[model samples]
Target: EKTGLHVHEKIKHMVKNYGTMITGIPAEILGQNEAEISVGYVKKMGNMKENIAEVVRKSEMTQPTNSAGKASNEVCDLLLGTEGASEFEKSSYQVLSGDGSNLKGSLPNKNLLVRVEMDRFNAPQKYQKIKREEFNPETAEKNKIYLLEDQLVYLDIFGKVIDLGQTSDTCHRLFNAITTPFYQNYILYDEYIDPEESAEEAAMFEMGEIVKAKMKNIDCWTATHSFTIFVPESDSEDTRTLYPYQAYWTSHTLQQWFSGDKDEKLSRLGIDGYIEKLALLGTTTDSKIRSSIYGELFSPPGKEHVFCTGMNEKFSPLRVKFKVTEVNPEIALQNLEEVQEFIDTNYPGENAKDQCELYKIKAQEAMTKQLEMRLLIE
Candidate 1:
């Protein structure tokens, strides 16, 4: 009969009858965002246990028990650890007494109770264990590496030190190569074309405007990344790790510029202004992951010498310990305000003010449209 079926089989049967709701776990936990779940684990489980129980209700849970509603050895072991899970304990508890004295059972759970197949979970490690090395200035010097605010320095393949001119030239040429032919071929907006004639008529139009603007600003290729630059501590002899300030080029700015289509009809429905900031400062991330939209550097060149002159003096004297450590609608407005304040305080001119004002408005538009926003410190 079905009496001798495995615990998993019984649960499967129940699931077949009543769906996954019988398991007392949320649909979200059963099918949640993998990245969000990963973040929870990285942040030390971050209240998942407390949260799991909160979502589960008595109404939702179909308790796993035998025909007589008695907890079995399998059920106990499945829910709790195996200890009172002895055969004698199982028999005696199921045998009962005058009063209610029996084992309790529940679904196996954790920060996220992911069901893992035994073979996969028990698989042997295939890769070698990595050794964690100490990271410091001495270690950096030993490797013939010099870390900058966001850039890095080392000899190139040709054994030459990289500079801004070298790095900038590559981006300039690439943009020119891709952009020049693009403008010659494309017409972004055509006043003569009637809207009802063709559905995809506006397709190339949007790309045209975006590429056209991008082509115009090819001279200064802006590079960006999220990095923790070391700063001198005033009070202490030891230096501390600090997250550098990120202004102008942020993820919020880039994601909007590239992902969004540039159709005018689309904007009538509504759109964001993040792309407007691209006029003054078109930036790309040096980060391999972050630079997915824009092509990343095969080998990023270092301009540390030019930015921070006398690299020997600065690099040698700097002895510091390293330390390491989003957006909503209101948050968007807030960012716009702060950015405007920054531009106003730092820059002064009729043209500069006009430009900053335009950038500020664009920042707000771009920020608001972002489905997910983050405060990234570089």
Candidate 2:
């Protein structure tokens, strides 16, 4: 289907033309020749209601041939491809439920019903400008709703869960944070329109129906909060062995890993490189004593016993990895200072010195602690 360039602007620029086909010309006019490009649009452009009714009528017409011996042969193709017209009628009922007009006969007196309610009921004035001066932190405090520790809140407009600490004020902050740049640019935009409005409306209405019908069966409130904790399972076999050289190398690796020196290209040399250096140093025997001493000095308090499980078929070392399960504020403060001193002495460079010092202080304040160990050979 070929349409003009304006169709491109309508679909791409305006954002409303979803599910409508737009044109893209073939790259070649002939077997190997380039063709000129142009825009096109396609849509099912007839009365959809009449077309659906016609399909239902055709389905009903095939129902009479089931009794005779030859009926099976005669109706085989039609029966194979058929659904009873009643299914379409049921779907139509769901479509009209939200409009309230559809309920006059069938569900007139149901205790609860779905209806297409507009946001105007909740917010009557379109683009109503509430005075900016009226928004004071103190005044808003009276209207604030407290969410119990893990209570979930549904954001109906966006169909998403609001996270912990996400109140109206937090939402406002997030909106400002996201849209500030676009507001600064002063560009106008429009929201997308969905062609499948009936389906979307049906899904939303079904959600309300399920909630209303089952609300009595659910617990409305709970006081207890839930959290998850991870504990390391002990390995009993003790097949792994630690190389003395790997201890030193792994410490060097850790130093490079956490050193917040960006300009020094520490970020480019990732964990893999650290592993490579550790492997090389383990076999090379260059300054083995010094490397081992360095490793001993830097090993995190409880992680001194770990070592590397060497290369396999892929030449990758099985190395000790650390994960932080819990944080201890006092120990973290002490370790941060120790790490800072270590970085300042070893990886000192002009661009990174100040940052290293800053982290030395911030780490103390952050209560940052980490898990550590070296990979051992089995």
Candidate 3:
């Protein structure tokens, strides 16, 4: 009755119970931090099949599995172009995978977590459908996961404590499969946080509702998203959630200033730093995403232009992209006031005037933090 990806033990059980695993039908294991099952379609290659059966055994996954004893569907995580890999895939895979003993490592290369899930899999029209168009999940096979295709390896796109991204080119989407959904950015937005809403009511009113991918490199960011972590009492396991903060743009400015060396810009994305960088030196994608933690135009502190001017210099090419204008601190105070207003309003409700000032307060925090950190660097 259950459907979704599973490990070799479950796969074996499926073959044992339903005898419907469909050998040789290529499937992928996608990681958040993302597999292919069958490894074949032709009568099956036996040894030629490229599924992770071999890798599963070779790695000796002591992780849990279904009743049949296969790894669950969520066991692995795949790679990403935008998100970047964790570690070892670059400097340590070969060295550690074998016995090089010559490889260096990071916190990740130092340790890891073996985990998986058997949740539903969904993909957008771009890859799932032959042509580029919308197809409903309920009516047809648009969003629902197919048995064989859903199988994959995942590092998980969401979060990983001891994360590692897709390794060698062999593990890339070209060879392996990629099966996941694209929840347009707006879906996660607070307004639409309701647990239930049909396609006709919610974000469905718009088309291509999505969390945008970074498209530019600039020291200037419109705004940022910062937070304090808290978990209220919850009797239900589903409501209980915990997440961490990754360094990005304005926030990274603060995080690095505090956590990284004062003299350095500090950047870490990907295995070998493929898209790796320190501060503004990161790729355009990197520059934009990090700096964009606050997604509003008025988020920066007054001294921000000056700070940005320096960053543009450090990173170069007039890439600070936003127009730098200033009388400075005067504007900073205004934004600070805005934050208190936001907390009061959004805490209970919102209106035409109270505004979402909390965002600006957080932005101010980023601004002040970066400045304070800069003062430390000074």
Candidate 4:
């Protein structure tokens, strides 16, 4: 959990992107609630109805599979459980019981559901047209209705849980943070999740996922939030580690993992390449750091057109490599034919002798520079 006024643009960005993952203040530090959340404070996002319907359908879709069925079953029965997500992006739900026990302090007719609309603003930076100001932060937050990336909200409407939202379960299976079972097992679980992980594991996971996403070509930069990346449980050279790294996209844990530090500025994705928060994790001693890069310089045969070099927005020093180990008369024949045309056009009336000489000095100047990558492993 984090502490600070959620007024800054960055905090708002956290609310927009990270949701409950952004801790406002440590409860002990605040001497009060770490966060002062007002329930049912707003009735917004008319899409809440659509949200509910979608969440409810995720029920019973996997009860037969014996995986988290109990939690799924319980969640499937929470009638007012809206499919919506977000305290700043999470599913909002109202817990109700038909036994009248849940009715004691509950609202009548209308349930005050909780939803978060992070303050969105027409932010101003440096100078220029960041100047224009028709933007309304108040209006935006009040009406904002965003859900965590892949929330799987379920519902048991009218106190009788039914199987309605099962089909959508597939989509949310690998990438979701809005369900009772998940909270119980992963985020909220003491056994499965640790408050503190090894530094190597954390850094390795961070860089690993970024590279994986780039390799997988999912979303160019960021993959699903809190994407998990597990290292080999046991590292022994003798053991055949088929998968030394595994990643999961559960958002909160990953965010909280790196966020506590003050100078998050220095953090690199994986490499020690001074590329902040972007490079794949490599050893400080220069080791192979598996990474995902856009294909620019020629990749492998199949991936020849992929982007993986000169990594910046502008493709620099783009060049192709040739490895014609065995050239024949056929190759020279085509070259001569093309040179003949060049001679006919530009170097008009040039004889074979002249063209042969031109291939040297002219060819040298044709492509004057080439991108060279050399490694000195000392």
Instruction: Name the top lDDT candidate.
Output: 1
- The Cα local distance difference test for each model comes to 0.25, 0.24, 0.23, 0.23
Stretches off by above 4 angstroms in model 3 are 1-134, 137-321, 330-378
For 175-252, candidate 2 gives per-residue lDDT tens digits of 333222332222111133132554433322332343334333433221111111111121331311111100122222
Best by TM-score: 4
Q: Which regions in candidate 2 have their CA more than 4 angstroms from the true location?
A: 1-252, 259-325, 338-378
Model 3 local distance difference test score: 0.23
lDDT measured at residue 325 in model 1 versus the true structure, 0 to 100: 9
Per-residue lDDT of 21 in model 2: 8
Tens digits of per-residue lDDT for model 1, 79-169: 2234422432333112111121110011111111111000000111111111123323333222122222232233222334332222434
Weakest 10 consecutive residues, lDDT, candidate 4?
123-132
Please give the lDDT score at residue 124 for candidate 1. Answer: 11
lDDT of 4 by residue, 1-378 (tens): 111111122322332233221222221222112112211222234554333333323322111111222212211212112232112123333222222232223322211221111111111111100111432333322211112223222111112211222234432432232233323222111233332454423322332233334334322121111111111112332331110011111211222222332112221222112221112121111221222322111122233233232342222111111110111223223333343354445433245345333433332222121100111111
- Candidate 2 versus truth, CA RMSD in Å, comes to 35.3
Q: What's the TM for model 3?
A: 0.15
Q: Is candidate 2 or candidate 3 better by lDDT?
A: 2
Query: Residue-wise lDDT of candidate 3 within 1-378, one digit each (tens)?
Result: 111111222322222221111111111111100112212211222442222234332321111122211111111111111112222112221112121111213212111221111112122222121211332233443222111121212111122111112234422322222222443211222455332454322322222232112111212221112211111223453432211112223333322222332211111222233112211222233434433421211122223333433343222111111110111122222332343343344423353222223322333333333333323233
Compared with the true structure, the alpha-carbon lDDT of candidate 2 equals: 0.24
